[PDB]
C-alpha cells in the first residue's frame, strides 16, 4: 500500500490537488521516515516537504492527515539539531501546541512527543516552546483526579516531555516555568509506574543541578523523602536519576544537606557504595564527598551509620574515578572533622589504602591525598602522637611513596612532600 515509496512519488502526491492523494502520500512519507536503518530525513527536508506537513497539522477537517503529518514531523524532529531546526523553521511549534487539545488522543499524544523532541534539543528551543505557551495545555492533560485512568503510554510521554522542559542549562529554564511545572512533577513522582518514576527523577535531577536557590524550590515542595525512598528501588533506571538528584542536593547549603540525612538517605549507602554498577558506586562516593564537606555533626552521622569503613573500602578497591571521589571524601572529612573523628578514621584503616594511592599517575589526586595526610598529622600534633603516626605510615610503605613524590613534575606536590618529610620525619 504505502510501503517503500520513493521520495519522488511522495512529492508527486502531496503536490496533487486531492486531499486523499495527499493523505496517502503523507502516510507513505511517515512509513519511510519510520524505517530503522538510515531513514532518509535529509532527503525529505530537501524536497521541501516540511512546510507542507506543517500545513496538514491545521486540517481539522481531516484528522488522519493531521496524525500522519504529525508523526512524519516527529520523526524528523527526533534527528539532529539541524533537522530539528528545519521543523521549528517550518513553524511547527505553535501548530503542535494547537494539537494538544485534539479530541483524538492519538493525535494529541503525537504532539506531546514532538514538543518533547523540540524542547529537548537545547536551551533556546526549550525556552521557545515555553514562550509559545506549551506548559498550560501540557499540564491540563494531566488534570484528572487519578493518574491511573490515563493510558500508560500516554502518561509516559507527558512525563518525558515535561522532563525535557526541565532539562538543559546556560541558561537553566525560566524560574516562572519551573514553579509552574513543579507541583505536577511532585505528583508524578508518586505515580505507580517505573518509567514515569524514572522520568520524574530525571526532571528533578535537572532542576537540582545548579545554584542553591534552584535546589531550594525543589526541596521546598518536600520531595526529599520520596527521592530517598526511590533510592532503594530495585530498578536501576529509577535509582540512577534518584541518586543524581540526591547528590545535587547535598552540594547546596548545610540545611539542604541535613534534609537528605533526616530523610534516611545514609541507610541506603552500604548498598550504593558496594553497588555492582560502576557509575552508581561513583555517584554514591561523590555524594559522600559532599556530605563530609559539611558540618561536624553531619560528619558524625556518617560515622554513626558505619559508612567510614565503606569509604575505606572504596578507597582500597574501586574504579579509579570512584577512588578519586573517595580521596575527596577523606580530605573533606579530615579538614572539617574533629580530632576524635580523625582518630576514628585512622582506627578504621585509612592510612594504608591512602598511601597506596600515592602511586597513582594523576597529579591532582596526589595533592588531595597529601592535603589529607597533613590534616591527620595536625590532629596528631594536638595529641602529640605524630611519631606513632609516622611509624604507621612508614610500616606500610607510606614514606617510600612520599619520598618518591619530590622527583615529580608538579612541585606543589614536591613542596607538599618536602614539608612533610622535614616536619614529621627525623
Ligand atoms: N568543611 C570542609 C569542607 C572543605 C571545603 C569545601 N570543599 C567542598 O565542599 C568540596 C570540594 C571538592 C569536592 C569534590 C571535587 C572533585 C570531586 N569530588 C568532590 C566536593 C566538595 C569548600 N570549597 O568550601
Blueprint of the fold:
Elements: H1 7-15, H2 19-33, H3 41-46, H4 49-57, H5 63-77, H6 81-89, H7 92-98, H8 105-119, H9 123-131, H10 135-140, H11 152-165, H12 175-188, H13 194-207, H14 212-219, H15 224-231, H16 236-249, H17 254-262, H18 269-272, H19 278-291, H20 296-304, H21 308-316, H22 320-336, H23 339-347, H24 351-356, H25 363-382, H26 386-395, H27 398-403, H28 411-424
Helix pairs in contact: 1-2, 2-5, 4-5, 5-8, 8-11, 11-13, 12-13, 13-16, 15-16, 16-19, 19-22, 21-22, 22-25, 25-28
This protein binds N~2~-[4-(pyridin-3-yl)benzoyl]-L-lysinamide.
PDB class: transport protein
Keywords: TPX2 inhibitor, transport protein
Assembly: monomeric
**Would you tell me the structural class of the helices and strands?**
mainly alpha
Task: Supply the CATH class.
Answer: Mainly Alpha
Give the percentage of residues in beta strands. Answer: under 5%
| Spatial gap, N to C terminus | 90 Å
User: How helix-rich are the residues, as a percent range?
Assistant: over 70%
CATH topology: Leucine-rich Repeat Variant
Number of domains: 1
| Total helical elements | 28
Name the CATH homologous superfamily. Answer: Leucine-rich Repeat Variant
**Radius of gyration using CA atoms only:** 28 Å
Largest sheet: none
Order of helices and strands: HHHHHHHHHHHHHHHHHHHHHHHHHHHH
Q: Report the count of strand segments.
A: 0
Name every ligand kind in the structure: N~2~-[4-(pyridin-3-yl)benzoyl]-L-lysinamide
Shape: elongated
CATH architecture term: Alpha Horseshoe
